[PDB]
Write a protein that binds this ligand. Structure first.
Ligand SMILES: *[C@@H]1O[C@H](CO[C@@H]2O[C@@H](C)[C@@H](O)[C@@H](O)[C@@H]2O)[C@@H](O[C@@H]2O[C@H](CO)[C@@H](O[C@@H]3O[C@H](CO[C@H]4O[C@H](CO)[C@@H](O)[C@H](O)[C@@H]4O)[C@@H](O)[C@H](O[C@H]4O[C@H](CO)[C@@H](O)[C@H](O)[C@@H]4O)[C@@H]3O)[C@H](O)[C@H]2NC(C)=O)[C@H](O)[C@H]1NC(C)=O
Ligand SMILES: *[C@@H]1O[C@H](CO[C@@H]2O[C@@H](C)[C@@H](O)[C@@H](O)[C@@H]2O)[C@@H](O[C@@H]2O[C@H](CO)[C@@H](O[C@@H]3O[C@H](CO[C@H]4O[C@H](CO)[C@@H](O)[C@H](O)[C@@H]4O)[C@@H](O)[C@H](O[C@H]4O[C@H](CO)[C@@H](O)[C@H](O)[C@@H]4O)[C@@H]3O)[C@H](O)[C@H]2NC(C)=O)[C@H](O)[C@H]1NC(C)=O
Ligand SMILES: *[C@@H]1O[C@H](CO[C@@H]2O[C@@H](C)[C@@H](O)[C@@H](O)[C@@H]2O)[C@@H](O[C@@H]2O[C@H](CO)[C@@H](O[C@@H]3O[C@H](CO[C@H]4O[C@H](CO)[C@@H](O)[C@H](O)[C@@H]4O)[C@@H](O)[C@H](O[C@H]4O[C@H](CO)[C@@H](O)[C@H](O)[C@@H]4O)[C@@H]3O)[C@H](O)[C@H]2NC(C)=O)[C@H](O)[C@H]1NC(C)=O
Ligand SMILES: *[C@@H]1O[C@H](CO)[C@@H](O[C@@H]2O[C@H](CO)[C@@H](O)[C@H](O)[C@H]2NC(C)=O)[C@H](O)[C@H]1NC(C)=O
Ligand SMILES: *[C@@H]1O[C@H](CO)[C@@H](O[C@@H]2O[C@H](CO)[C@@H](O)[C@H](O)[C@H]2NC(C)=O)[C@H](O)[C@H]1NC(C)=O
Ligand SMILES: *[C@@H]1O[C@H](CO)[C@@H](O[C@@H]2O[C@H](CO)[C@@H](O)[C@H](O)[C@H]2NC(C)=O)[C@H](O)[C@H]1NC(C)=O
Ligand SMILES: *[C@@H]1O[C@H](CO)[C@@H](O[C@@H]2O[C@H](CO)[C@@H](O)[C@H](O)[C@H]2NC(C)=O)[C@H](O)[C@H]1NC(C)=O
Ligand SMILES: *[C@@H]1O[C@H](CO)[C@@H](O[C@@H]2O[C@H](CO)[C@@H](O)[C@H](O)[C@H]2NC(C)=O)[C@H](O)[C@H]1NC(C)=O
Ligand SMILES: *[C@@H]1O[C@H](CO)[C@@H](O[C@@H]2O[C@H](CO)[C@@H](O)[C@H](O)[C@H]2NC(C)=O)[C@H](O)[C@H]1NC(C)=O
Ligand SMILES: *[C@@H]1O[C@H](CO)[C@@H](O[C@@H]2O[C@H](CO)[C@@H](O)[C@H](O)[C@H]2NC(C)=O)[C@H](O)[C@H]1NC(C)=O
Ligand SMILES: *[C@@H]1O[C@H](CO)[C@@H](O[C@@H]2O[C@H](CO)[C@@H](O)[C@H](O)[C@H]2NC(C)=O)[C@H](O)[C@H]1NC(C)=O
Ligand SMILES: *[C@@H]1O[C@H](CO)[C@@H](O[C@@H]2O[C@H](CO)[C@@H](O)[C@H](O)[C@H]2NC(C)=O)[C@H](O)[C@H]1NC(C)=O
Ligand code: NAG
Ligand code: NAG
Ligand code: NAG
Lengths: 328, 162, 162, 328, 162, 328
C-alpha cells in the first residue's frame, strides 16, 4: 500500500567466471580475456620486409657460396631468416668456421647484402678455380665455393709469394672470407702448393693474421683426409685488405657489403610455412593480430607484440558478481 | 562481499537492468518503474575503464627476446643466457597472474561499495520520512508521485516538505 | 580498523570462542549461551585458505641458480653472471616482503568486514523489534525464547511476528 | 531485564605478531611462518643419487689421472660434486688446462663415466710410460698421469712420425685428453724427442689441431723448468680420433665415456660433511625438509626447494587482530 | 569514494582545519568551536608514516649497473648484457609505477574510512539522544554545554544521563 | 536552535594531484614527489677519492706509455675513470691489444698503481730504446712507449738468445706488457733482428707463451707497413717473469703494481666537466643529493643512490582527497 523506492543492481545470463585471490570461479556480469590464444601459423612479412627462407642451405653455405646454393648468389634483403633444420648443405669441403656464431649474428642482423668482387685470380701467378668431389654443383660436375678460390701452384712446379690489395670504396662494411687447406700427406702439400711449409698472411688497417699448414692424416669425411680451416673478417669503409700467400690459402674472391638492420633473427623451424601475409606481430609460432596485453604463442617475437605468458586464460572482471535474479 | 550489499542485504540482481549496473525500482499510485542510475553507473564505468587502460599500459612497455646461438665450448654462457630468459619470464608470469587475482578481488568489492553508497545516499535523503525494509527497499510514509520519485532519484528531495 | 568493528564498536574479543572467529552471545529467561557462527566462520576459513594456497602456488614456480666458474680473463662475464643472480634475487625479495605486508593489511581488514556484516545482518533481521546498544549487542523489545534466539542466529527470524 | 543477543569475535593468548604496510607488530589470533630456517647441515643423497666428494683431488686431477688419485680410477656416478677447496692435488706436472671451466662443466653435468682405453703405446715405435718426480704416486715412487702417456724417443736416437686411430664405437660421447711438453733447453728437446722442432697433430671428423714445442727456460715450479700445455676434446658417437707425432706429444691413453645428466653442480665447500641422508631439497648450506614457500639457507640448491629469501621471518596473518578479551 | 564519507555524505572539507585531517564543529548556547581530533588524526599520521617508510625501505636495497666494454667479436655477449640491464630496469619501472597507483588508491580510501569511523563513533555514543541531519551533523535533543561537548569529543559521553 | 556537533575533514588550497589505478589527477591535501630530477652536472669526488680524467690519452695509451701521455707516468689513484671519447692518443705504433676489454677492466677496477721497473735493457746484448715517427713525444722528436722497449740487433750484425728474470717481491699483483713486431719485408726483419725467423718466449709460474714473426706487407697506417701485436699478463705476489728473445720482442720494461678497489667504472663522456665537489651519489649524468627513493638522471651510478626510473614524476598521496570547502 505505501509508495516504495528500491535500490538494485544488474543480473544477467553471462556464464563468465573469474578467479580472485580469495575465491575461485566467481560468476561476473562482464569480463575480458587478457591472453590472445589465436595466431596464423605462418612466417609473414613485417614492416622490415620479407623473411629469407633457407630450405637447402645454412647461412655459412650461402656466405661462402657452396656451389649447390647458386639460387642465393643474387643480391638479397630480409626482415628475418627462417633456416630449416633439415637444410643439408653447409661447408662442402670438410672443416670448421672460426667464430661461426658471430659470423651468423653480424650477417643476419643486416637488412641486405651486395656481393662485391674483391679479387680476380685469372691475372695471378697461380692455377686458380680448383674443384673437388666434396663440393659438387647442383648440375652434377665437381665445383668449389663461389666466394673463396682454391689457388694451387702454376703447372711448371711454381708457387712464389703472390700478393694483392683490395680497397673498400663501397658505402658500408664488407664481410670477407678465406680458408687454409691442410693436406693429409707431405706428398699432397708439394703436388698442390710446391712449398713444404707456406706463409699465408691476411691483413687490413686493424687485423694482422698469418697461417702455416698442419700436415697429417685426418679421418675420412665426404671422401677427403685433407681439411680446411675457414676464417672471416670485416673490412670497414675505406680500409685496404692485403693478402699474401705461397700456398695453402683458399683466397677471398667475393665479399658481402652489409646494409641496414633487420629484426636480426635466425629461426630454426621445420614445419611452419612462409606465408603471403602482413603482420604487426610475428612470433616464432606464427603471426598475431590482437590488442590483448598477453599471448601464449611464443616468448620469441618481433614487431609490436603482446607480452608472453604460459597461461591458457587470464580473465579480468569488468562487471559485478553475477547473482541469481530476484523480481523488483 | 566486503561492503555487504551485492549478494548481501540486497539478495539478488535485476535481469531487466541491461543499460546499467545500479538503479532504482519504484511503485506508487501512478504505477511502476525500473531504470539504471546513469550517474553511479557512469562513475563506475570511468573507474574500471581507467583500471583496464592502466593494466594494458603497464604490460605493453617494449620487451624482446632475441634467440642466440652458442658453440660446444660456450656451454656456461648458453646456460647463463637461458637463465636470464627463464627467470625474467618467470617474474612477468608472477606480475600478470597476481595483478588479475588482486584487481578481480578489488573490482568486485568496488561494485559492492557503489551499491551500498547509492542505498546510503537515498536512505539519508529520505531520512525519517521512510521506513527501511532491509532488502534495499524504502516504504515512504507520505504520498510520493512520479515528480517526488524523480526528485529522490536525481537527489533534490527535501524531507522537510513532508 | 577499516570497517570499525574489531577493536572498534565491539571493543574486544571473547576468550571463550575457540572453535570459530565470529559468533553470538544471548541472554533470555531460559539463561545464557555463547557459540561460534559456523556459516560466517567457514566462509572466512575458505577465503584465507584460497589466499594461502594462491601465495604458495605463485612462489613455487620452478627456479634454479647453477653456480658457474670463470677464468682470470673472464672477469666481465663473471661480474655479468653475479649481476643476474643478485638482481633477480633482489626482485623476488621485493615480491615476497611486499606481498606479506599487503595481504596482512587486507586479511585483518577482511576479518573486520566479516564482523561488521554479521552485526548488520542481525540488525536488519531484528529491524524495529530491537534497540541497538552500540557495543555489538541488541536489546529485543519482546520475549525471545531459545527457539526465537536460534531463529535470529540461523536467519529465519520474521520481525512481523512480534 | 530485556532478552539480549550480541555479536562477538575470538580473542586468545597468542603472542604472534605480523607487520602490515601501515602497522608494525600487530597481534593476531593465528599466523603462519613462510620462511624455513631449519636445515640438516650435511650433503645428502637426492633422487639423482650420491654426491662425489673430492677431498684429495680437484676434478682435472681425476680426469687426467694424477697418480695420487688412483682411488677415483674406478667407473663412478654422482648427483653432484663436493670439491674441498683444501684438495691439494691438481695437475702434478707444471702447466695449464686450456678451457678448464668448460671441461669441469661438461664432466660435472654428466651422471657417470666409464674409462675407455683409446690407445696401447707398448706396440708403438717410442719409449712410452715416462715418469717424473713432479708426479709421484701415493706409494712414493715417481710416476705420471694414468689418462695421458709421456712418449719419448726409442733408445737408439729414433722418433719417426708415429700415428694411430681410435673409433668411438661406445654408447655415448668420449672426453679425450692430451698434453704438449715444452722443454726448458734445446738440449733436453733433443735428449727426449730427438727432433729440434716437432709436429704433433690431434684430429677427428670435426676438430683439426696441430702443436709445435716452444723451447725456453720457465721459472722453477715443483722442480721443473719444463712446462706442459694440457688440451681436451669430445669424440662423438661413431667419430674417429687420429693422433700423429714425432715428439713432445703427451698422447691420449684413456678417455671418459659420459652418460646421463646429474644436477651438474660443483660445490666448493670445506666444513659441511657428506651425510648418510636422503632429501627432496639439497641447498649448498644443507638439506631442507619443508612445505614453507621460502628458506634462508642458500640461493644455491637442487631438487624441489622453497624460494631463497635473505630474511629471518615472513609471518602471514591467518586469523584476526588479537584484542584484550571482554566478558560476553 | 569507497566508504562514502569524503566528497560523500560530508560534501566538503573545512578550510579552517589546518593542524589536523579530521575534527569537530559544535554550536550551543555558549557559542561556537572547530578543532582537529588529535587521536583520529595522529592514528592516520602513524599509518601513512609507516606506509611511506615501508615504500622507501623496499626501494633502497643495494643495486648497481657497472657499464661493460665488448670487442667487435663479442656482439652476442654485448646484446645479452644490454638485455639484462633493459629487462631488470623494466621490471623495477613496473614495481614503482604500480605501487604508487595502488597505494594512492588505498591511502585516499583509508582517509575516507577514518572520517566514516569518527562519524559512526559519535553517532553510537550519542545514540537516541541526537537526530542525524545526514551531512555529518547531529542535533542533540537535550541542552549540551561545553562540558557535555568535550565529553562527546573525548568519548566519555554517557547517553543515559540525558 | 538545538545544540549541534558535526564531523568534518581538512580542505586546503593545495594544487597537488596524484594518479590512482582508477582515477587520473585526483586533488589531495598533502603529497610527496618520489623522483629526484635535480642533479649537479659534474663528475665529483666520492668517499673512494677523485676521478682520473683522460682528455688526451685512452687507458691503454697510459698503461703502455704512449710518449704523448708522460703527464700520466706518475704513480696515481682514482675512484673512477672519465675517458673523453675525443682523446686522440691510443697505441701509437699500428697494432691491436689482445684482450683489451679485460686489460681496461682489471686496471680500472684497481684504486691506484705504482710503476715498477721489471728490466734494465742497457746491460742487455742488444740495441735498446728504439724509436719511431709513429710514436712522437709531445716535445716533437721521434720516441717510443715508456712501458715496453724496442730491442733491435747489436750493430755488428748480432742478436743471440738474450734472456732475463724479474721476481715480484712487491706487495701486490703486477700488470706486465709486451709486443711482437711484424716487419713488412724479409729485408727489414734481417736489418732489425738479424734472424729470418725468431722465437720470443714470455713465461711465469702459471703462463707459457711463445711468438714467431709473420712477415708480409700490411696496409700503410700512420706511415708504417710494419705491425705490432700487443700482449699483457698478471705477475702475482712472489711469481717470477722470464723473457727470452733472439728478435721481434718489444720487451717489458715497466709493470703496474695494482692496489685496492675503486668503483671500477670507465665513463665515456665528452661534455660533463670534472667538478670540485663531494657527493654520496655520482651518476653518469651528474651528482645527486636526495633522500627520495627514485631519480631519472641515469641507470649508471656509484655510491648510495636512489633507484633509476625513466619517469618525470611519481607523486604519492599523504593527505586526503582535496574538496571545495564548505562553511562549518
Ligand atoms: C660428387 O659427385 C661425384 C660424381 O657423381 C657422378 O657424376 C655426376 C655428374 C652425376 O651424374 C652423379 O649422378 C654421379 O654419381 C660423386 O661420386 C660418385 O658417387 C657415387 C655414389 O657413391 C658412386 O656410385 C657408386 O659407384 C660404385 C662403382 O660403380 C662402378 O662399378 C660397379 C661394379 O663394377 C658397376 O656396377 C657400375 O656400373 C660402375 O661401373 C658402385 O659400386 C656403387 O653401387 C653401390 O651403391 C649404390 C648406391 O650408391 C647402390 O645402388 C648399388 O646397388 C651398389 O650397392 C655406386 O653406384 C660413383 O662411383 C661416384 N663417381 C665418381 C666419378 O666419383 C660424389 O659422391 C659426389 N660428392 C659428394 C660429397 O656427394
Ligand atoms: C717426489 O718424491 C721424491 C722422492 O721422495 C722420496 O722417495 C719416496 C719413495 C719416499 O720415500 C719419500 O718419503 C722420499 O722423500 C721427492 O724428492 C725428495 O724430496 C725431499 C724433500 O724435499 C728431499 O729431502 C731433502 O733431502 C736433502 C738432502 O738429503 C741428503 O743430504 C743430507 C745432508 O748431507 C742428509 O742429512 C740426508 O740424510 C740425505 O743424505 C735434505 O737436505 C733435506 O733436509 C732438509 O729439509 C727437511 C725437510 O724437507 C728438514 O727436515 C731437514 O732438517 C733439512 O732442513 C731433505 O731431507 C729428498 O732429497 C728428495 N729425494 C729425491 C730422490 O729427489 C720429491 O720432492 C717429490 N715430488 C714432489 C713434487 O713433491
Ligand atoms: C712525427 O713527427 C714527424 C716529424 O715532425 C716534425 O719535426 C718535429 C720535431 C716538429 O718540429 C714537427 O712540427 C715537424 O712536423 C712527422 O713527420 C712530418 O710530418 C709532416 C706533416 O705530414 C710533414 O710535413 C709535410 O712536408 C712536406 C715536404 O716538405 C718539404 O718540401 C716542400 C716542397 O718542396 C717544402 O715546401 C717544405 O718547406 C719542405 O722542404 C710538405 O709537402 C707538406 O706540405 C703540405 O701539407 C701541409 C700540411 O701538412 C700543408 O700546409 C702544405 O700547404 C702542403 O699541402 C708538409 O709540410 C713533414 O715533412 C714530416 N717530417 C718528417 C721529418 O718526417 C710525423 O708525421 C709525426 N708522426 C705522426 C704519426 O704524426
Ligand atoms: C705475378 O708476377 C709478376 C712478375 O713477378 C708480378 O709483377 C711484379 O710485381 C712487383 C711488386 O708489385 C713489381 O715490383 C714488378 O714491377 C712487377 N713486375 C711486372 C713485370 O709487372 C705480379 O705482382 C705477380 N702477381 C701477384 C698476384 O703477386
Ligand atoms: C587485424 O584485425 C583488425 C581488427 O579486427 C582488422 O581490421 C579490420 O578489418 C576489417 C576488414 O578489412 C575492417 O572492416 C575493419 O574496419 C578493420 N578495423 C580496423 C581497426 O582497421 C585487420 O584486417 C586484421 N589484420 C589482418 C592482417 O588480418
Ligand atoms: C594457448 O592457449 C590455448 C587455450 O588454452 C591452448 O589451446 C588448448 O590447448 C589444449 C591443450 O593441448 C587443447 O587440448 C585444447 O583443445 C585447446 N583449447 C582451445 C580453446 O584452443 C593452446 O594450446 C595454448 N598454447 C599455445 C602454444 O598456443
Ligand atoms: C711403427 O713402425 C711400423 C713400421 O714402420 C709401422 O708399420 C707400418 O705402417 C705403415 C702405415 O700404416 C704401413 O704402410 C706399413 O705396411 C707398416 N709396416 C709394417 C712392417 O707393419 C707402424 O705403423 C708404426 N707404429 C706407429 C704407432 O706409427
Ligand atoms: C620430512 O618431514 C616429513 C613430515 O613431517 C616426515 O614425514 C613424516 O615422518 C613420520 C615419521 O616417519 C611419519 O609418522 C609421518 O607420517 C610422515 N609424514 C608424511 C607426510 O610422510 C619425513 O620423515 C621427513 N623426512 C626426513 C628425510 O626426515
Ligand atoms: C636464517 O634465519 C634464522 C632465524 O633468524 C637465523 O638464525 C638466527 O641467526 C641470528 C644471527 O646470527 C642468531 O643470533 C640467532 O641465534 C638465530 N636465531 C634462531 C631463532 O635460530 C639464521 O642465521 C638465518 N640465516 C641462515 C643462513 O640460516
Ligand atoms: C749477454 O751475454 C753474456 C755473455 O754471453 C751473458 O752472460 C752469460 O750468461 C750465461 C747464462 O746466464 C752464463 O752461464 C755465463 O756465465 C754468462 N757469461 C758472462 C761472461 O757473464 C748475459 O746473460 C747476456 N745477457 C742477456 C740479457 O742475455
Ligand atoms: C645535501 O643536502 C643536505 C640537506 O639539505 C645539505 O645539508 C644541509 O646543509 C646546510 C648548509 O650547510 C645545513 O644548514 C644543514 O644543517 C644541512 N643538513 C644536514 C642534514 O646535514 C648538504 O649541504 C647538501 N650537500 C651538498 C654537498 O651540497
Ligand atoms: C627528469 O625529469 C625532469 C622533469 O620532468 C625532466 O625535465 C623536463 O624535461 C622536459 C623534456 O625535455 C623539458 O621540456 C622540461 O623543461 C623539464 N621540466 C622540468 C620541470 O625540469 C628531465 O629532462 C628528466 N630527464 C632527465 C634525464 O633529467
Ligand atoms: C536467461 O536465463 C533465464 C533463466 O534460465 C531464462 O528464463 C531466459 O529465457 C534467458 N534469457 C534469454 C534466453 O534471453
Ligand atoms: C590466558 O591468559 C589469561 C590472562 O593472563 C589467563 O588468565 C589465562 O589463564 C590464560 N589461559 C591459559 C593459561 O590457558
Ligand atoms: C585560498 O583560496 C581561497 C579561494 O580562492 C581564497 O579565498 C583564499 O584567500 C586562499 N587562501 C590564502 C591566499 O591563504
Amino acid at each position: 500500500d505505501p509508495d516504495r523506492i528500491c535500490i538494485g543492481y544488474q543480473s544477467n545470463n553471462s556464464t563468465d567466471t573469474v578467479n580472485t585471490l580469495i575465491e575461485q570461479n566467481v560468476p561476473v556480469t562482464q569480463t575480458m580475456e587478457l591472453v590472445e590464444t589465436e595466431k596464423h601459423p605462418a612466417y609473414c612479412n613485417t614492416d622490415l620486409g620479407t623473411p629469407l627462407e633457407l630450405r637447402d642451405c645454412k647461412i655459412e653455405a650461402v656466405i661462402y657460396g657452396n656451389p649447390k646454393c647458386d639460387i642465393h648468389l643474387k643480391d638479397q634483403g630480409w626482415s628475418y631468416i627462417v633456416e630449416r633444420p633439415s637444410a643439408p648443405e653447409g661447408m662442402c669441403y670438410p672443416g670448421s668456421v672460426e667464430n661461426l656464431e658471430e659470423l651468423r649474428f653480424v650477417f643476419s642482423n643486416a637488412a641486405s647484402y651486395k656481393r662485391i668482387r674483391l679479387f680476380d685470380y685469372s691475372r695471378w701467378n697461380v692455377t686458380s678455380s680448383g674443384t673437388s668431389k666434396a663440393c659438387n654443383a647442383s648440375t652434377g660436375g665437381q665445383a668449389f665455393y663461389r666466394s673463396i678460390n682454391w689457388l694451387t701452384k702454376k703447372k711448371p712446379d711454381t708457387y712464389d709469394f703472390n700478393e694483392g690489395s683490395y680497397v673498400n670504396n663501397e658505402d658500408g662494411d664488407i664481410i670477407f672470407l678465406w680458408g687454409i687447406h691442410h693436406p693429409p700427406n707431405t706428398k699432397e702439400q708439394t703436388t698442390l702448393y710446391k712449398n713444404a711449409n707456406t706463409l699465408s698472411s691476411v691483413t687490413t688497417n686493424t687485423i694482422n693474421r698469418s697461417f702455416q699448414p698442419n700436415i697429417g692424416p685426418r679421418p675420412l669425411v665426404r671422401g677427403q683426409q685433407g681439411r680446411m680451416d675457414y676464417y672471416w673478417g670485416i673490412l670497414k669503409r675505406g680500409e685496404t685488405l692485403k693478402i699474401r700467400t705461397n700456398g695453402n690459402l683458399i683466397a677471398p674472391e667475393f665479399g658481402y657489403l652489409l646494409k641496414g638492420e633487420s629484426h636480426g633473427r635466425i629461426i630454426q623451424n621445420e614445419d611452419i610455412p612462409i606465408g603471403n601475409c602482413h603482420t604487426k606481430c610475428q612470433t616464432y609460432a606464427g603471426a598475431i593480430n590482437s590488442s590483448k596485453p598477453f599471448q601464449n604463442a611464443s616468448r620469441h617475437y618481433m614487431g609490436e607484440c603482446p607480452k608472453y605468458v604460459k597461461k591458457a586464460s587470464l580473465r579480468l572482471a569488468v562487471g559485478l558478481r553475477n547473482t541469481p535474479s530476484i523480481e523488483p | 562481499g566486503l561492503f555487504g550489499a551485492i549478494a548481501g542485504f540486497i539478495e539478488g540482481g535485476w535481469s531487466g537492468m541491461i543499460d546499467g549496473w545500479y538503479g532504482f525500482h519504484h511503485s506508487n499510485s501512478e504505477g511502476t518503474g525500473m531504470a539504471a542510475d546513469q550517474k553511479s553507473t557512469q562513475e563506475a564505468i570511468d573507474k574500471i575503464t581507467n583500471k583496464v587502460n592502466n593494466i594494458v599500459d603497464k604490460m605493453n612497455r617494449e620487451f624482446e627476446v632475441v634467440n642466440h646461438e652458442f658453440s660446444e665450448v660456450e656451454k656456461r654462457i648458453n646456460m647463463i643466457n637461458d637463465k636470464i630468459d627463464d627467470q625474467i619470464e618467470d617474474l612477468w608470469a608472477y606480475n600478470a597472474e597476481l595483478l588479475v587475482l588482486l584487481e578481480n578481488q578489488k573490482t568486485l568489492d568496488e561494485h559492492d561499495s557503489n551499491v551500498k553508497n547509492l542505498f546510503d545516499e537515498v536512505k539519508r535523503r529520505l531520512s525519517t520520512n521512510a521506513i527501511d525494509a532491509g532488502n534495499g527497499c524504502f516504504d515512504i510514509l507520505h504520498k510520493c508521485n512520479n515528480e517526488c520519485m524523480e526528485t529522490i532519484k536525481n537527489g533534490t528531495y527535501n524531507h522537510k516538505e513532508y
